[PDB]
Design a protein around this nucleic acid. Structure first.
Ligand code: ATP
Ligand code: MG
Length: 437
RNA sequence: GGCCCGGGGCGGUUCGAUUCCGCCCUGGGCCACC
């Protein structure tokens, strides 16, 4: 098992077979026909246009070009009108920039409205750079589309592909930019082993320099960081994956990881061994787009974790999971139960003014002096992580994300013990605790 | 929607808060949905 022979076998998993390619071409042809009958101005971009789409993940992108003068509202209505009229079955679900997703002769299709600008200077719609991305790539990626495919397959199998908030990883465009910069998949991996959180890649200048943070400047817009949404941790995972791969090649890196079914009875034993407090906040999932949801689940989860730490429950890690029914914020603390009393720091014996105010407080145990300053024994309002979060989430629901908070406000519960291991969160929990196997 | 930077008003907690927990108003960037 050497890189060379492995990279060779890997092409069999990333490159689309003659039939899938035919299915794509056939679907492409039908799109043209439907669009041409409408006399609409369009252009094919993305993976399909450059033949860099991942085997099994074919999606065609059709961009409807509209004059800059048109209203953002006109793009939406006209664009959605054209999309719907041109797809076999469709769906309209997006967070901000409008588009229509659908199917044509079996292949996934995205019909997207955008302004046809000159120069990607001061973008008007969120997607206006895309057409220029294509113009810049088509004549440079030619000859290395399979190299691109290796990178996509590499990141996909290790959960860091997409750039959407659910993944916070490497976008497809980012992948192609990296291929044009390093020349191949093996070269990208080799060099990625030495990236830092300060690494700056400027493909248009053929330069790598140091900067404020990880930055891949778009050749089409020097101010656009193509990797703006690639999280620090995922950047760290990829770098480490590149070290491991080069240290011990294996097409296991291109195979999606084991589904993992581990029994609930086993998770219970582990928890028992860890002696930790493992609970979750469960509430109804807001009827919103993934891209609006996850950033809210991250915020709610974090705001509760911070409460758990300043509250001295010694939180270990947090996680979250969304089903179609509900959401779950998961937690694990080192403290299952803390005392009722604690000590609050008072003023230095020195100034009687504040000391006087400090001791006038109606107290249960009477303050004392230690190392030159007063201290007082205080009582808590709750002694466990669960009671703490129940209180917090009931009162601070508004700070837990616009939609997520509003849902928690109308209903939420804290699950623990045996009743928790039944919910659809076993995977996340094992992940969260580092259970190996 | 989320994040970052800034105005202006507030409540709570505290011996002590611009600084700790939060709430209203608001300006400017950025990101995800292609
Ligand atoms: N987050 C993004 N950052 C930069 N460019 C993007 C982004 N999302 C989409 N694009 C542009 O739109 C095109 C289509 O994006 P899409 O989400 O369909 O993925 P793709 O690039 O087609 O690759 P793949 O379909 O294999 O994931 C990209 O090639 C790129 O030019
Ligand atoms: Mg596509």
């Amino acid at each position: 098992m050497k890189v060379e022979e492995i990279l060779e076998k890997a092409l069999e998993l990333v490159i689309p077979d003659e039939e899938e390619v035919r299915k794509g071409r056939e679907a492409e042809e039908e799109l043209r026909r439907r669009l041409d009958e409408l006399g609409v101005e369009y252009v094919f971009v993305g993976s399909y246009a450059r033949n860099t789409w991942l085997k099994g993940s074919l999606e065609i992108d059709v961009f409807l070009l509209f004059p800059e003068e048109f209203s953002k509202e006109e793009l939406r209505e006209r664009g959605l009108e054209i999309g719907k009229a041109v797809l076999d079955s469709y769906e309209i679900r997006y967070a901000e920039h409008p588009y229509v997703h659908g199917v044509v002769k079996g292949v996934e299709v995205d019909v997207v409205p955008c302004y046809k600008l000159k120069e990607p200077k001061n973008i008007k719609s969120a997607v206006d750079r895309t057409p220029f991305h294509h113009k810049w790539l088509e004549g440079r990626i030619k000859g290395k589309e399979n190299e691109v495919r290796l990178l996509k397959g590499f990141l996909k199998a290790n959960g860091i592909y997409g750039a959407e908030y659910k993944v916070r990883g490497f976008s497809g465009y980012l992948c192609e930019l990296l291929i044009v910069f390093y020349g191949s998949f093996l070269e990208t991996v080799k060099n990625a082993r030495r990236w830092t959180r300060r690494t700056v890649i400027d493909v248009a200048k053929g330069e790598v320099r140091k900067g404020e943070e990880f930055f891949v400047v778009d050749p089409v817009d020097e101010k656009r960081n193509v990797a703006a949404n690639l999280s620090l941790d995922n950047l760290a995972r990829f770098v480490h994956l590149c070290r491991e791969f080069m240290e011990a090649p294996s097409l296991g890196f291109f195979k999606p990881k084991h589904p993992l079914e581990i029994e609930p009875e086993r998770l219970r034993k582990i928890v028992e061994e860890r002696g930790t407090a493992v609970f979750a906040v469960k509430f109804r999932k807001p009827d919103i787009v993934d891209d609006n949801l996850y950033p809210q689940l991250e915020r709610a989860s974090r705001k509760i974790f911070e409460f758990l730490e300043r509250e001295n429950f010694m939180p270990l890690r947090s996680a979250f999971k969304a089903s179609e029914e509900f959401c779950y914020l998961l937690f694990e603390c080192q403290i299952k139960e803390i005392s009722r009393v604690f000590r609050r720091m008072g003023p230095q014996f020195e100034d009687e003014r504040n000391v006087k105010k400090f001791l006038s407080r109606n107290r249960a145990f009477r303050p004392f002096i230690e190392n030159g300053r007063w201290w007082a024994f205080e009582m808590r309002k709750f002694t466990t992580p669960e009671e703490g979060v129940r209180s917090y989430a009931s009162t601070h629901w508004h700070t837990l994300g616009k939609n997520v908070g509003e849902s928690i406000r109308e209903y939420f519960e804290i699950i623990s013990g045996e009743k928790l291991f039944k919910e659809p969160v076993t995977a996340e929990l094992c992940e969260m605790m580092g259970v190996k196997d």
